Design an enzyme around this catalytic site. Structure first.
Site, PDB file in Angstrom:
ATOM      1  N   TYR A  14      48.181  33.810  45.183  1.00  0.00           N
ATOM      2  CA  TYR A  14      47.019  34.670  45.052  1.00  0.00           C
ATOM      3  C   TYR A  14      45.730  33.890  45.312  1.00  0.00           C
ATOM      4  O   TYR A  14      44.855  34.347  46.059  1.00  0.00           O
ATOM      5  CB  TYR A  14      47.020  35.282  43.655  1.00  0.00           C
ATOM      6  N   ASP A  38      37.751  42.989  35.703  1.00  0.00           N
ATOM      7  CA  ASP A  38      37.089  41.802  36.245  1.00  0.00           C
ATOM      8  C   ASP A  38      35.602  42.089  36.356  1.00  0.00           C
ATOM      9  O   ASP A  38      35.165  42.760  37.306  1.00  0.00           O
ATOM     10  CB  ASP A  38      37.663  41.437  37.612  1.00  0.00           C
ATOM     11  N   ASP A  98      33.284  29.379  37.073  1.00  0.00           N
ATOM     12  CA  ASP A  98      34.568  29.003  36.486  1.00  0.00           C
ATOM     13  C   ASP A  98      35.213  30.239  35.874  1.00  0.00           C
ATOM     14  O   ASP A  98      34.564  30.984  35.150  1.00  0.00           O
ATOM     15  CB  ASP A  98      34.390  27.906  35.431  1.00  0.00           C
ATOM     16  N   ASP A 101      42.087  33.756  35.115  1.00  0.00           N
ATOM     17  CA  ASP A 101      42.739  35.036  35.295  1.00  0.00           C
ATOM     18  C   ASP A 101      44.033  35.033  34.504  1.00  0.00           C
ATOM     19  O   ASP A 101      44.781  34.053  34.519  1.00  0.00           O
ATOM     20  CB  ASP A 101      43.110  35.308  36.767  1.00  0.00           C
TER      21      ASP A 101
END
Ligand SMILES: C[C@]12CCC(=O)C=C1CC[C@@H]1[C@@H]2CC[C@]2(C)C(=O)CC[C@@H]12
Ligand SMILES: C[C@]12CCC(=O)C=C1CC[C@@H]1[C@@H]2CC[C@]2(C)C(=O)CC[C@@H]12
Ligand SMILES: [Cl-]
Ligand SMILES: [Cl-]
Ligand SMILES: [Mg+2]
Lengths: 126, 126
Positions: A14, A38, A98, A101
């Site tokens: 990913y 997100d 920074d 996930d």
């Protein structure tokens, strides 16, 4: 579900796809009923086309780069978490962000849920 | 405090690592809400409540010879949550374990939930 080793590989893939900006390949990693949060804390996005639109808006400019900053941590229940840094350009100013996930995968190896942890405390102007 | 801001999350999560590193079990337990849950490793059944949480930390840290340090910045959200990467060092061989913890805080600044992402793929021996 994917094994811990497979999760590490999927999550590293990913990041590679984000780094090269292959939006179509990223979208095809998601389940058709996946959700993206997100940044975490904002309402979830659902659906392939909405996820595609999200990545187009974020990666469209082409000046986004991303690399892992440590190993992928993976569970035995098809989930993992990874730390990475995104580099981008924001009104001339080069920046870095920074991020961590967290992902849950389904039985087909597709991303079912993605949650991205970051805020302005994780932003740096270079 | 109230529900922690993103900056406060960064400080609380860094303090947690300090407490793990020194092995102050009672101080760790008092960072948790009274009815908090811990899932460590993520994928195993949760534990519930300060007494179960104290037993967990007493077992894991009571033998001594565990150290811990952040390996990158704490990522924090605006809804009282954060995620952090760190490494635990322990000892028949000296090994290291790479972990990411995700925490949600309550309106009093205490940890309501903690999920720890790691498995045997994140263990390194020598
Ligand atoms: C989508 C994204 C990359 C893939 C990923 O998994 C996580 C993130 C979160 C931060 C995004 C970033 C792409 C670039 C973005 C849109 C910016 O210019 C500001 C915020 C940032
Ligand atoms: C509890 C703990 C530290 C605090 C933290 O936040 C996350 C973890 C998970 C891994 C634990 C570790 C403590 C040391 C343990 C028990 C070992 O010797 C093997 C697994 C490892
Ligand atoms: Cl790391
Ligand atoms: Cl990092
Ligand atoms: Mg309460």
């Amino acid at each position: 579900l994917p094994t811990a080793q497979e999760v590490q590989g999927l999550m590293a893939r990913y990041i590679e796809l984000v780094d090269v900006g292959d939006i179509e390949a990223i979208v095809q990693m998601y389940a058709d009923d996946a959700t993206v949060e997100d940044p975490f804390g904002q309402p979830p996005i659902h659906g392939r086309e909405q996820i595609a639109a999200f990545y187009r808006q974020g990666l469209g400019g082409g000046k986004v780069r991303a690399c892992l900053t440590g190993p992928v941590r993976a569970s035995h229940n098809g989930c993992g978490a990874m730390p990475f840094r995104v580099e981008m350009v924001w009104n001339g100013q080069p920046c870095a962000l920074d991020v961590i996930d967290v992902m849950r995968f389904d039985e087909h190896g597709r991303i079912q849920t993605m949650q991205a942890y970051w805020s302005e405390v994780n932003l740096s102007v270079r």
